[PDB]
Design an enzyme around this catalytic site. Structure first.
Site, PDB file in Angstrom:
ATOM      1  N   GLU A 182       1.446  -1.223  -0.015  1.00 49.57           N
ATOM      2  CA  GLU A 182       0.222  -0.480  -0.213  1.00 49.57           C
ATOM      3  C   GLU A 182       0.848   1.657   0.365  1.00 49.57           C
ATOM      4  O   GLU A 182       0.563   1.880  -0.811  1.00 49.57           O
ATOM      5  CB  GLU A 182      -0.954  -0.243   1.221  1.00 49.57           C
ATOM      6  CG  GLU A 182      -2.157  -1.717   1.016  1.00 49.57           C
ATOM      7  CD  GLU A 182      -3.025  -1.251   2.340  1.00 49.57           C
ATOM      8  OE1 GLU A 182      -2.630  -0.186   3.146  1.00 49.57           O
ATOM      9  OE2 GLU A 182      -4.226  -1.701   1.730  1.00 49.57           O
ATOM     10  N   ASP A 191      -6.158  10.217  -1.336  1.00 50.09           N
ATOM     11  CA  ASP A 191      -6.573   8.440  -1.779  1.00 50.09           C
ATOM     12  C   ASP A 191      -6.500   8.428  -3.181  1.00 50.09           C
ATOM     13  O   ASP A 191      -6.809   9.700  -3.935  1.00 50.09           O
ATOM     14  CB  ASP A 191      -7.127   7.699  -1.236  1.00 50.09           C
ATOM     15  CG  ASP A 191      -8.069   8.223  -1.004  1.00 50.09           C
ATOM     16  OD1 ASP A 191      -8.755   9.448  -1.066  1.00 50.09           O
ATOM     17  OD2 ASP A 191      -9.087   7.405   0.287  1.00 50.09           O
TER      18      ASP A 191
END
Ligand SMILES: O=P(O)(O)O[C@H]1[C@H](OP(=O)(O)O)[C@@H](OP(=O)(O)O)[C@H](OP(=O)(O)O)[C@H](OP(=O)(O)O)[C@H]1OP(=O)(O)O
Ligand SMILES: O=P(O)(O)O[C@H]1[C@H](OP(=O)(O)O)[C@H](OP(=O)(O)O)[C@H](OP(=O)(O)O)[C@@H](OP(=O)(O)O)[C@H]1OP(=O)(O)O
Lengths: 332, 106
Positions: A182, A191
């Site tokens: 990630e 994000d």
């Protein structure tokens, strides 16, 4: 540049007095070369005597140190085995320091051999240039077979020391796994969506306000952060996310039976999946989860590879599938 | 000097424990029980003294642990390069040998 003389000295100075005059007498040997203008002159035989004496001192010191390390290794391994994870905060700190220090000393003996060897080559080169002889090749062939150069069983001892430390001073296996998959960010970012995130995929708020994401960060950490955090603040935040994810799994009827059956490693691969697509997305792999529960590793791999997820993030998906196959961190 | 092995030291501990421990065992007895090739009384005496020495009875800790993690990381990286260096030193000598075999034949 190589800066050999300077680096050899810098290392000698960083050793205990027992290591006093144990290294190559590089400065001395370079001065004795100036005196060199059986078919061998007394000067040449005397210089060759200094080189043999050097080798004797290297080999005699190395094997004596190996012996100490063999005794130390067994003693540390017993101390670790006797305690069996029941050490106090005081005792655990002590034994960890002692094993990291022991590891360091063995790397020091390995560096001693590398530095002595490098200088030996430098001396023989100067010697051959000065004498017109061609003895560096047979002399170094002799050296490359000596205990000190080969490293002997020191490689096995460092390996054993490192194995004691993989248990005693462990790394957060799941944290390093997801900081690869990630990614670890110490500053408030946005994000794939338009929401504020920090660390390893830790959503702060869906709010468009940057101060709303800041106030949530100061609450989660407990200090005035300003939007920046440290590695351990991000690690403790992630550990809380893992615990929350496991709490979710253990209360999911489609995920708990398979999670319970998996080993610690294959459990981290499943948590990885949950972090990426959510509890609901993972629970949808009914057939693959059945193969994992039945410990049919290869069958579950072939099946997971034909999912849309495998095409979405292939690098990450392959690494997770390999973890389910092998049950090791060898993909990371 | 004696090239000790972890297996050989394990046998020495057993021999000495069987003789009542490091404070009761004699080098002569350990020598007899072990029956090891090229091992002498001198080796056993030297080994027992090192054994007796290694068995001598008498911010924040989180920051000390973090310092150990880096200490270990740096030692492991040096170790890796030293393994690499050994191969480099061997190649140098192999090419140096070829360069000598080539110039004599011209
Ligand atoms: O390196 P230096 O700072 O110049 O010191 C040197 C040197 O000592 P080291 O090289 O071992 O450190 C020797 O001179 P070299 O052999 O290197 O030329 C030495 O002995 P010599 O009599 O052979 O010259 C000499 O003299 P001494 O030890 O009597 O003080 C001494 O001092 P100098 O700087 O005056 O040459
Ligand atoms: O002047 P220094 O900084 O003290 O370094 C010198 C020299 O550098 P220069 O030739 O550029 O002036 C050489 O350094 P490197 O070859 O490692 O790059 C080397 O001299 P030699 O290789 O020709 O022998 C070395 O000596 P050493 O072999 O001990 O590393 C050393 O000279 P000193 O150590 O005598 O000061």
């Amino acid at each position: 540049s190589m800066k050999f003389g300077k680096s050899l000295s810098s290392q000698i100075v960083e050793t205990l007095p027992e290591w006093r005059d144990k290294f190559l007498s590089y400065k001395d040997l370079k001065k004795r070369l100036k005196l060199i203008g059986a078919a061998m002159t007394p000067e040449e035989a005397g210089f060759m005597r200094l080189l043999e004496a050097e080798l004797d001192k290297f080999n005699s010191f190395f094997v004596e140190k190996e012996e100490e390390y063999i005794i130390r290794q067994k003693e540390l391994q017993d101390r670790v085995a006797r305690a069996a994870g029941r050490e106090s905060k005081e005792e655990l700190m002590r034994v960890r320091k002692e094993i990291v220090d022991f590891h360091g000393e063995m790397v020091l003996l390995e560096n001693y051999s590398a530095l002595n060897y490098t200088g030996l080559v430098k001396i023989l080169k100067k010697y051959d240039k000065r004498t017109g002889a061609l003895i560096r090749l047979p002399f170094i062939q002799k050296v490359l077979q000596q205990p000190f150069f080969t490293t002997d069983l020191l490689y096995k001892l460092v390996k054993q020391c490192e194995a004691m430390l993989d248990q005693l001073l462990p790394s957060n296996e799941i944290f390093e796994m997801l900081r690869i998959d990630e990614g670890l960010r110490l500053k408030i970012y946005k994000d794939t969506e338009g929401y504020y995130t920090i660390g390893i995929g830790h959503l702060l708020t869906k709010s468009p306000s940057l101060n709303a994401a800041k106030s949530e960060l100061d609450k989660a950490i407990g200090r005035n952060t300003n939007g920046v955090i440290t590695k351990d603040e991000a690690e403790k935040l992630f550990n809380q996310d893992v615990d929350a994810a496991v709490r979710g799994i253990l209360r999911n009827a489609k995920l708990k039976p398979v999670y319970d059956s998996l080993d610690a490693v294959r459990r981290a691969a499943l948590i990885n999946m949950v972090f990426q697509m959510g509890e609901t997305g993972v629970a949808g792999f009914t057939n693959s989860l059945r193969m994992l529960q039945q410990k049919r590793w290869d069958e579950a791999a072939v099946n997971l590879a034909k999912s849309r997820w495998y095409n979405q993030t292939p690098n990450r998906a392959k690494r997770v599938i390999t973890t389910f196959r092998t049950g090791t961190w060898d993909a990371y | 000097r004696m090239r000790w092995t972890p297996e050989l030291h394990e046998r020495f501990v057993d021999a000495m424990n069987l003789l009542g421990g490091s404070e009761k065992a004699t080098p002569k007895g350990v020598m007899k029980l072990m029956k090891a090739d090229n091992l002498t009384i001198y080796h056993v005496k030297s080994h027992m003294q090192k054994y007796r020495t290694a068995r001598y009875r008498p911010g924040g800790n989180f920051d000390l642990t973090e310092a150990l993690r880096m200490q270990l990381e740096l030692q492991k990286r040096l170790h890796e390069q030293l393994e690499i260096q050994r191969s480099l030193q061997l190649r140098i000598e192999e090419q140096g040998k070829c360069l000598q075999m080539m110039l004599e034949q011209q």
